[PDB]
């Protein structure tokens, strides 16, 4: 059952991202229950991403050294249990939830690092691109369903707690499948030398910084904008926040698919016009995404619908680059340094962005809110002001992509010379 194995792997990835983003949709309830501020809310995602980055390389090394299936299934079970246990935490305690988020990060890093290897080892033909395509499409759908399930479970059960209790169960079932169906899969100095040679690749460094900016934007936005929309509805007379998160997730999944598709199409069209089309299309998309991510805050007060269309277009643009960055990395770097290059790029993108970026946004929100008077209007304005920083980082990432475009051909030439000589 190789096809069933791929299907269950995709379902497990969906559940992985569902568990990752279930907290974002129910952030208001957690913050109100534990009596914490925006800083404490950020801590959750910040610690999760820190754990993910610190754990993924370990899990890759262990997967190539030890059985992949055992690690994958044990991870499924591990974060499922961690989530279901974190559902039960005394309101007085707060750090236990952060520890649970970190452990879920460990497990989800295990999965995100091992599952692609299994998907590849099951089968290597050109049809492998399609199977990996569905595996990766599990990502935006997973995030959208995370928001949807958070909102819906919170509304139906009557307590936010159950938002962390339904998802675990399914995971375990998926775990029971990942071992039943999937069959057995078919130099420190070298790593140091590869790194020492990668830092001198200007396009690689600039693309890494640009994707770090993208990580910053994605993390901050996807973690805060549900609460931001609820705050916007609160400050205005028409107040909802489950519906806001529901609509955000529904837009998120569709926007992820459409953004990937449009990025691929724009790449295919613009390559014929000129080489170095990937960095340039990425940078243009980043500029547009920054413009509309800044437009969301202006549209919030006037009406929520305009903010939602701004979300749509900005998500489309910022999401399109997700499929082009990998092609950029592949084109720049030679095969001897591709694995190390990818690992370093992932680590740097998680470090410079998506790790502490939600915490930084929450800290800024707290700073403005405490410096000024405390009230729904001030809280809304402070969250908007903090989120204002994300467009600047997106513009920085776009400039980095433009720089990468500048050095693109020369770096290709050096790579070709290294390969040939």
UniProtKB/Swiss-Prot annotation:
* Taxonomic superkingdom: Eukaryota
Keywords, comma-separated and alphabetical: Cell membrane, Deafness, Disease variant, Endosome, Lipid transport, Membrane, Non-syndromic deafness, Transmembrane, Transmembrane helix, Transport
From the Swiss-Prot or TrEMBL record, state where the protein is found: Cell membrane; Endosome membrane
Q: Which GO terms describe its molecular function?
A: sphingolipid transporter activity; transmembrane transporter activity
Q: Which reaction does it catalyse?
A: sphing-4-enine 1-phosphate(in) = sphing-4-enine 1-phosphate(out); sphinganine 1-phosphate(in) = sphinganine 1-phosphate(out)
How does the record classify its membrane topology?
A: Multi-pass membrane protein
Q: Name one GO biological process term.
A: lipid transport
Q: Which GO terms describe its cellular component?
A: endosome membrane; membrane; plasma membrane
Query: Which stretches are transmembrane?
Result: 42-62, 70-90, 103-123, 130-150, 162-182, 209-229, 246-266, 280-300, 304-324, 348-368, 389-409
Q: What is the effect of changing residue 101 to S?
A: Loss of function; does not rescue the cardia bifida phenotype in the morpholino knockdown in zebrafish
Q: Main role?
A: Lipid transporter that specifically mediates export of sphingosine-1-phosphate (sphing-4-enine 1-phosphate, S1P) and sphinganine-1-phosphate in the lymph, thereby playing a role in lymphocyte trafficking. S1P is a bioactive signaling molecule that regulates many physiological processes important for the development and for the immune system. Regulates levels of S1P and the S1P gradient that exists between the high circulating concentrations of S1P and low tissue levels that control lymphocyte trafficking.
Involvement in disease: Deafness, autosomal recessive, 115: A form of non-syndromic deafness characterized by severe sensorineural hearing impairment in early childhood. Sensorineural deafness results from damage to the neural receptors of the inner ear, the nerve pathways to the brain, or the area of the brain that receives sound information.
Q: Family assignment?
A: Belongs to the major facilitator superfamily. Spinster (TC 2.A.1.49) family.
Name of the protein: Sphingosine-1-phosphate transporter SPNS2
Gene (name only): SPNS2
């Amino acid at each position: 059952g190789r096809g069933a194995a791929a299907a269950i792997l995709s379902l497990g990835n969906v559940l992985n991202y569902l568990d990752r983003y279930t907290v974002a949709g129910v952030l208001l309830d957690i913050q109100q229950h534990f009596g914490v501020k925006d800083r404490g809310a950020g801590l959750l995602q910040s610690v999760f991403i820190c754990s993910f980055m610190v754990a993924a390389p370990i899990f890759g090394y262990l997967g190539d050294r030890f059985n992949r299936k055992v690690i994958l299934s044990c991870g499924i079970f591990f974060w499922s249990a961690v989530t279901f246990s974190s559902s039960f935490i005394p309101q007085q305690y707060f750090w236990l939830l952060v520890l649970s988020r970190g452990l879920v990060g460990i497990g989800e890093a295990s999965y995100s690092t091992i599952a692609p290897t299994i998907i590849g080892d099951l089968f290597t033909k050109n049809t492998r691109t399609l199977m990996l395509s569905v595996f990766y499409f599990a990502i935006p759908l997973g995030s959208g369903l995370g928001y949807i399930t958070g909102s819906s479970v919170k509304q139906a059960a009557g307590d936010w707690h159950w938002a962390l209790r339904v998802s675990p169960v399914l995971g375990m079932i998926t775990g029971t499948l990942i071992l039943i169906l999937v069959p057995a899969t078919k130099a420190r100095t070298s790593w140091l030398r590869d790194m020492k040679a990668l830092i001198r690749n200007r396009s690689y460094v600039f693309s890494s910084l640009a994707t770090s900016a993208v990580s910053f934007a994605t993390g901050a936005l996807g973690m805060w904008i549900p609460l931001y929309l609820h705050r916007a509805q609160v400050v205005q007379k028409t107040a909802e926040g489950a519906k806001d998160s529901l609509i955000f997730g529904a837009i998120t999944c569709f926007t992820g698919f459409l953004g990937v598709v449009t990025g691929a199409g724009a790449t295919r069209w613009c390559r014929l016009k000129t080489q170095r089309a990937d960095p340039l299309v990425c940078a243009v998309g980043m500029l547009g995404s920054a413009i509309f991510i800044c437009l969301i805050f202006v549209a919030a007060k006037s009406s929520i619908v305009g903010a939602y269309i701004c979300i749509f277009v900005g998500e489309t643009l910022l999401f399109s680059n997700w499929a082009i960055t990998a092609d950029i990395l592949m084109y720049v770097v030679i095969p001897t340094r591709r694995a190390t290059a990818v690992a370093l790029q992932s680590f740097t993108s998680h470090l410079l962005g998506d790790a502490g970026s939600p915490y930084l946004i929450g800290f800024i929100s707290d700073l403005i809110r405490q410096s000024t008077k405390d009230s729904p209007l001030w809280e809304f304005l402070s969250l908007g002001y903090a989120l204002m920083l994300c467009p600047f980082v997106v513009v920085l990432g776009g400039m980095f992509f433009l720089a990468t475009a500048l050095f693109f051909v020369s770096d290709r030439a050096r790579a070709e010379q290294q390969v040939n000589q």
